[PDB]
Amino acid sequence: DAAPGASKLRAVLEKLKLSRDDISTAAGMVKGVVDHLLLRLKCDSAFRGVGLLNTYEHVKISAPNEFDVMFKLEVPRIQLEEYSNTRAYYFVKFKRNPKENPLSQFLEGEILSASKMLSKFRKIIKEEINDIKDTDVIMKRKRGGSPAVTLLISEKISVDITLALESKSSWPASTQEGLRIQNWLSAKVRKQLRLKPFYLVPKHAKEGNGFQEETWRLSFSHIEKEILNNHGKSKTCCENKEEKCCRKDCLKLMKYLLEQLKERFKDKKHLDKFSSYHVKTAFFHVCTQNPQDSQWDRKDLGLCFDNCVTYFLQCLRTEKLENYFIPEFNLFSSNLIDKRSKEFLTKQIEYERNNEFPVFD
Template structure:
């Protein structure tokens, strides 16, 4: 394995141990290693710098032989080059992904410890006291507090599974247009990037549809009008046709009506359906457990046709996860959710929006260029840690400032996917460089805000930061808040 070296034979002569203080390349005390991690290498200054004690020496990010390193924070990333990396051949051993569907809520990660590879030297542990005052230490402390507790995960998962199972069973047993729906778990909980508490879940109720014909609506490539190439006799969805077009709003309205009826039959749980939000594709349930758990039930049409032409240049993972993986993922079904296109101050009720949340879930779970990245016994990276920190930063800022209402965690997830594409190597996401990696991500995100360009990861011509979606004033406000936090050591992280 790259980065491993044999342990030197123990010296037979007994010499008194010399205590040494280990510092990383930023001059701060090295972070502690964890079971299952490949031990991080100790950073070292040049001998001349060490003798002279030059306080102005800039930190350098080390790269392994043959690998490019992520630029340090004074080398600003460009938002327009998010996917611009040199192409590398895909691994011939790369296997097509299994179908990402999971019928039930997972009950939390396994607690087994990963075994350290034979012959690999571990980095010396620094004391918590030494780490506490460093940027690295503060970020790791935040991540520790954000980590979900296993007992809470299991408790919430059992409740959600119970409610979802009741709804699915009821729909199968009643004569309706949604008799054949199947579950598809998506969202941050199933991607293992949920933070703070297991109180929000997204569950798709997918419905396979016969051969469809899509007509792009607008110029974003994200919204479509759906028609059937051939309508078989007795097709229950014909009730929702307006002319030849399948109305998303009509179908969602009936879906909501059935969900509300079935929720009333749940007697052993305190469950209610929240009021409909304009433009939202979800039917939101509120479960009091006694803590509140929000569950978004999202109707999704499953299409097994080729992905729409607007996605042809999307999913730029060839140089990161490989060409074979990209081809395999694009052979999976795509989904259409009843998210209406906005027209001025109203919504076009017939339109559906493309959804690739199932593919995003797969990528987040299999995010490393090395197959064993973050697996038990494999090397750990800080990719998902940076995502969690940025999600939490935006979440906390939104609690304090109404001006940030237009921003959401999907913007953060899209930005991090572009970052992972731009910097695919493990060495560029080494856990011991968490602070600099997070700062690089902030630099990239701020640059996207300044240029007003954050392109959809699967639909390259769909700009999530366009003026039509988010006004410039809101973007400038978020830029100022992010810069204030990073320049002052993230005081908002102390507000737990």
């Protein structure tokens, strides 16, 4: 066997810089649209606590012209009801609130209605983006059983806005044994990231017959961004010129490779299954498998990229990708992802692996 060439992987990184050269106009367009929309949310009295969580989140690094802009909303303390032992889908019940914040006034019964929230959220967006002058922002289809709220800013700038609840409470009990950055960063950094707030995004339970259920799954984007800014066991990783690692490098390599496979083999009905969040969680488990900055060195660029490919293929074959935050939650379940889809992705990544990756040029 042989590792992929580190010069070739740095050439792919240079091609990734060439992919992300187009920030400076799309960032201005989305900043103008976010500015106008945030200065029209303040006109509404029933949503006076909404906000922009500050995470520019390139989930799609192979094409940075599409944005997924997340909004935060400061909520009261929430009693959480787990749905159907699914270990990730929870019900939002505002436990007790004497101030009577208007989200509770919008609520139905005791469970916060996610469909009602996303419906009136779409209603306010459709109503307010019409008012935008000299910036053609139109309401794209909400289909696909996802957060959606697709907004196109006038030339291929597809912004998928998803408002997210942010509870500053304590973490749920299923998130206890997770965040295994103890031997990777420290137990103290683990406990300090545990002190940071968690997030709530909707998805109805898509298990066969479950339709428009009011479930709420946890998001972990900000902790993952903060550990991407501090990723070495040594705290000056990719900061001084003796500790240039390949964690950011191999992670961008894996995510670009997955998104180029999803762009090429994009025939309908198979793509919806895979995301680079899965690759990022598998990469965090590779960081658990490879904890040392000596085991992420620049001479180990091809070796760590190979280890990431083989561990993602391990998660595809053994059908087990635990969340790095929830140990009791496999992201590669057989009902969210089809088994022929798992075989196809395993076959394509093995196909690209065993022929020295001819996609890299």
